[PDB]
Enzyme design. Structure first.
Site, PDB file in Angstrom:
ATOM      1  N   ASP A 260      21.968  39.446  96.399  1.00 55.05           N
ATOM      2  CA  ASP A 260      21.439  39.383  95.042  1.00 55.05           C
ATOM      3  C   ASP A 260      22.396  40.038  94.054  1.00 55.05           C
ATOM      4  O   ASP A 260      22.923  39.383  93.149  1.00 55.05           O
ATOM      5  CB  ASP A 260      20.063  40.049  94.996  1.00 55.05           C
ATOM      6  CG  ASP A 260      18.982  39.198  95.636  1.00 55.05           C
ATOM      7  OD1 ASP A 260      18.988  39.060  96.877  1.00 55.05           O
ATOM      8  OD2 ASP A 260      18.123  38.671  94.901  1.00 55.05           O
TER       9      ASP A 260
ATOM     10  N   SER B 143      18.242  48.883  99.413  1.00 56.38           N
ATOM     11  CA  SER B 143      17.222  48.521 100.390  1.00 56.38           C
ATOM     12  C   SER B 143      17.441  49.345 101.651  1.00 56.38           C
ATOM     13  O   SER B 143      17.200  50.556 101.654  1.00 56.38           O
ATOM     14  CB  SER B 143      17.261  47.024 100.705  1.00 56.38           C
ATOM     15  OG  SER B 143      16.878  46.772 102.045  1.00 56.38           O
TER      16      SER B 143
ATOM     17  N   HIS C 153      13.474  47.822  99.539  1.00 62.36           N
ATOM     18  CA  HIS C 153      12.459  47.539 100.541  1.00 62.36           C
ATOM     19  C   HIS C 153      11.476  48.702 100.547  1.00 62.36           C
ATOM     20  O   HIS C 153      11.890  49.867 100.532  1.00 62.36           O
ATOM     21  CB  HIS C 153      13.091  47.328 101.921  1.00 62.36           C
ATOM     22  CG  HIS C 153      13.574  48.586 102.579  1.00 62.36           C
ATOM     23  ND1 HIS C 153      14.082  49.654 101.872  1.00 62.36           N
ATOM     24  CD2 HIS C 153      13.641  48.935 103.886  1.00 62.36           C
ATOM     25  CE1 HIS C 153      14.429  50.612 102.714  1.00 62.36           C
ATOM     26  NE2 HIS C 153      14.173  50.200 103.942  1.00 62.36           N
TER      27      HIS C 153
END
Length: 589
Positions: free
Chosen positions: A530, A411, A438
């Site tokens: 995550d 990200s 992202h």
């Protein structure tokens, strides 16, 4: 100074005291939504928050005000807003959850406290008749045979006992608990007044507790605690007009700051370096010199972590993604339009960002820019594919290998720290890499570079571009599965977010029961946890899990990259393909 990271957070007053204007602007609604008759029956709407600066609390439940603090840690140290607009769904409506879980599971305490106060009033009520019966038969041996008798003078009670109404059988056990609360709310307002040491756990509560979304209503103190000491987090303005950067007052609350303001992309380089902040919040098109170059004209001078505001037109997918090779880190997903009630949330997509973008010392700048060394292009996969791109493809030196790719994303740090990893995927080696990141068309201009620059072709995930010869990639509402024939493809996933994020974890968790041994998963630079509870099982069995500090910048995704031990080792970034192809050498053969 390193506790400055905790100081670089609590711009974290804006996420805090933010929904109090969702009480005066949302209880004055339950008001003139009523009329000239509903005039004296609507105010007791307890302004529920948490105030050490002033007198103000939630009616009793200090747990739910800490339970709303077991929450902001991950919501900020994982960056849920500074990414994709869909990553904040179960989050602006999960505010109302714990809100309406205390506006929902706080009468399972009340009614059950007039229940627990009804049982005791009726657990000694057997001992008022048993203290009445045994009170009416002892002057029967005292008095000279005075009769009147007890039992006929007893059933007046058992008549009245059940002739009682809730005003005596549910409200008299209720006219006591809150009457005993007049004997209680002393010591609930004595814990935090006759002592200033409730902020001691609170200003120490900015480094513990775990949950995950946006229901901090007003925990970490109102606007002004002088404990916002030393040096804050400033941030320079750079937008195309005047109103754009309530967009100048986005920071002027009690945390992140403004310093310089300029429409020009030149009067900014002559501004962000003058009175040093920690980030210049800047956009695309600038009068005289462009925002594309308004960063490298300041990078080749002062590589400040630039916050690239980019309201993309599908062609701004390069201004947002060429300026990453010019020095970006995390980009704002710049909006614009209906000024209503979302600026309260649209600011956390900006200020929590710098509380995560300005979370850098001078490491990322002093990583390849201590001298005058430009990194350049690519080397050669020495430990793996170069040893194949240098010898005999014939059966002398061949391998008993298989053609099963090894998956994997990232990200914040995807822009460049992940790009230098994908630029060395050889076409001679059948592979497939995860990228879930992202960001909206950015999945069509972030794989276009590795496609053209690197000598292999990687794609944007459609409705199934089965892959090895290219790459999975693209976070686009994005479950690769197996038919009945032996390999995998590229299928999508779109339910309520896995781990409340829109979902790096799921596609890693899928592969632990899908392809196995010739399969790898890796972590690089983002901020989510995550890839810690998902690839936990791929290395709790058999499947390599792969960051170190020297290369990138802010570490919240690798922050907890050693608390588990499933990771093999550490690993910074340079020529990753030398090793990430050496993982497809012994388990595929």
């Amino acid at each position: 100074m390193s506790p400055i990271l905790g100081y670089w957070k609590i711009g974290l007053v804006q996420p805090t005291r933010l929904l109090l204007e969702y009480l005066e602007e949302k209880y004055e609604e339950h008001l003139y939504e009523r009329d000239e008759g509903d005039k004296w029956r609507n105010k007791k709407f307890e302004l529920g928050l948490e105030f050490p600066n002033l007198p103000y609390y939630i009616d009793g439940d200090v747990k739910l005000t800490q339970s709303m603090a077991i929450i902001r840690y991950i919501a900020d140290k994982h960056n849920m807003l500074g990414g994709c607009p869909k990553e904040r769904a179960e989050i602006s409506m999960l505010e109302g959850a714990v809100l309406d879980i205390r506006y929902g599971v706080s009468r399972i305490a009340y009614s059950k406290d007039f229940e627990t106060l009804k049982v005791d009033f009726l657990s000694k009520l057997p001992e008022m008749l048993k203290m009445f019966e045994d009170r009416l038969c002892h002057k029967t041996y005292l008095n000279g045979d005075h009769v009147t008798h007890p039992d006929f003078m007893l059933y007046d009670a058992l008549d009245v006992v059940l002739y009682m109404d809730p005003m005596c059988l549910d409200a008299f056990p209720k006219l006591v608990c809150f009457k005993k609360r007049i004997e209680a709310i002393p010591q609930i307002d004595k814990y935090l007044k006759s002592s200033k040491y409730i902020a001691w756990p609170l200003q120490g509560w900015q480094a513990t507790f775990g949950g995950g979304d946006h229901p901090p209503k007003s925990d970490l103190v109102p606007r002004g605690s002088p404990e916002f000491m030393a040096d804050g987090v400033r941030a320079v303005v750079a937008d195309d007009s005047h109103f754009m950067r309530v967009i100048s007052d986005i920071l002027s609350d009690g945390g992140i700051d403004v310093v310089a303001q300029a429409r020009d992309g030149e009067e900014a380089v002559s501004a962000v370096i003058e009175h040093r902040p920690d980030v210049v919040t800047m956009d695309v098109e600038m009068p005289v010199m462009n925002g594309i170059e308004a960063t490298e004209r300041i990078m080749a001078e002062s590589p400040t972590p630039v916050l690239m505001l980019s309201a993309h037109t599908d062609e701004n997918a390069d201004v947002t993604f060429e300026a990453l090779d010019k020095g970006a880190v995390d980009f704002f997903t710049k909006p614009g339009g209906e000024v209503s009630m979302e600026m309260s949330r649209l600011k956390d997509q900006l200020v929590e960002m710098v509380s995560s973008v300005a979370a850098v010392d001078v490491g990322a700048t002093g990583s390849r820019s201590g001298t005058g060394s430009d990194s350049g292009t690519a080397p050669t996969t020495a430990g793996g594919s170069a040893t194949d791109r240098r010898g005999t493809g014939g059966s002398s030196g061949q391998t008993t290998y298989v053609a099963n790719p090894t998956l994997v994303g990232s990200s914040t740090g995807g822009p460049k720290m992940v790009e230098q990893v994908m630029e060395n995927l050889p076409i001679e080696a059948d592979l497939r890499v995860l990228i879930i990141q992202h960001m909206e068309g950015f999945t069509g201009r972030f794989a276009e570079r590795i496609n053209t620059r690197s000598d292999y072709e990687v794609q944007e995930a459609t409705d199934g571009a089965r892959i090895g010869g290219e790459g999975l990639v693209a976070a686009g509402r994005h479950e690769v599965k197996n038919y009945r024939n032996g390999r995998l493809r590229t299928k999508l996933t779109q339910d309520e977010p896995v781990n409340s994020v829109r979902a790096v974890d799921v596609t890693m968790q899928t592969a632990a029961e899908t392809i196995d041994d010739p399969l790898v998963g890796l972590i690089l630079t983002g901020m989510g946890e995550d890839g810690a509870d998902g690839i936990r099982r791929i290395k709790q069995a058999g499947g390599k899990t792969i960051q170190d500090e020297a290369t990138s910048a802010v570490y919240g995704m690798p922050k907890r990259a050693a608390e588990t031990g499933c990771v093999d080792t550490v690993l910074p970034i340079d020529d990753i393909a030398d090793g990430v192809i050496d993982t497809i050498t012994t388990e595929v053969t």
